[PDB]
Design a protein around this ligand. Structure first.
Ligand SMILES: N[C@@H](CCC(=O)O)C(=O)O
Ligand SMILES: N[C@@H](CCC(=O)O)C(=O)O
Lengths: 108, 54, 54, 54
């Protein structure tokens, strides 16, 4: 059976924004933006359904000092709360320790 | 890009880095996601959406 | 490289010329060159994350 | 940027792509080479090297 994959992301303009009818809409329709269009394209190429979810603490973050407990967008994946992340997540050596990245789609 | 435009950028870039699609390590989604990203970068859809949103 | 070409897939004969051919047919173990990442080259060889943009 | 300096550049970049170290899909070094390239990029050795030859 097709799983609705648990996509995780974070709200940020113009990447992901609450559409101004969010009080009157339900499902993924509340979300639009560059990253939502990219997620739609990726899912349409891979051929699966998906469900959007939002980061808990609102942070990109890293592993906590002297504890190395992961949190943020990285922590959600490291603890297996979600299937895939589509966010303005910068490629870094510490993040490559634990999660894989695609080839870079934008430079900054 | 947006009003009131009361603020402006200065200077050049200090560095260069990239964004990417990220997946839990070794999951079977990673390689087809990467191939999809490559194909979308070869088709230029990312640039059309960039113009669309900036 | 024996004949001084970056190389690609041939004219639909699906033989590889130049440095990519030297890799695919096992003539050398690792390339260190300005070899551009492309969707056809990813078919047969692995690339690191990029070191430069152009 | 070096003598004879007699041409002139026109226009910007029409696209964006990158280079990468590449190896046959037959060896384990694809991870330590990635970690090496990332380490060199973060330590700024690429900037020292770029500001040595351009
Ligand atoms: N793209 C950055 C956002 C936060 C920042 O470094 O300013 C990251 O993934 O960490
Ligand atoms: N770095 C290029 C050289 C040829 C070019 O595109 O100008 C390549 O690997 O194909």
């Amino acid at each position: 059976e097709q799983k609705t994959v648990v996509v995780t992301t974070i709200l940020e303009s113009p990447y992901v924004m609450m559409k101004k009818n969010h009080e009157m809409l339900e499902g993924n329709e509340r979300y639009e933006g560059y990253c939502v269009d990219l997620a739609a394209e990726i899912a349409k190429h891979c051929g699966f359904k998906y469900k959007l979810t939002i980061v808990g603490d609102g942070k990109y973050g890293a592993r906590d000092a002297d504890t190395k407990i992961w949190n943020g967008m990285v922590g959600e994946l490291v603890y297996g709360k979600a299937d895939i992340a589509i966010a303005p997540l910068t490629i870094t050596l510490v993040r490559e320790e634990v999660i894989d990245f695609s080839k870079p789609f934008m430079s900054l | 890009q947006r009003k009131p435009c009361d603020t402006m950028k200065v200077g050049g870039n200090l560095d260069s880095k990239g964004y990417g699609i990220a997946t839990p390590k070794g999951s079977s989604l990673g390689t087809p996601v990467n191939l999809a990203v490559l194909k979308l970068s070869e088709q230029g859809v990312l640039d059309k959406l960039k113009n669309k949103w900036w």
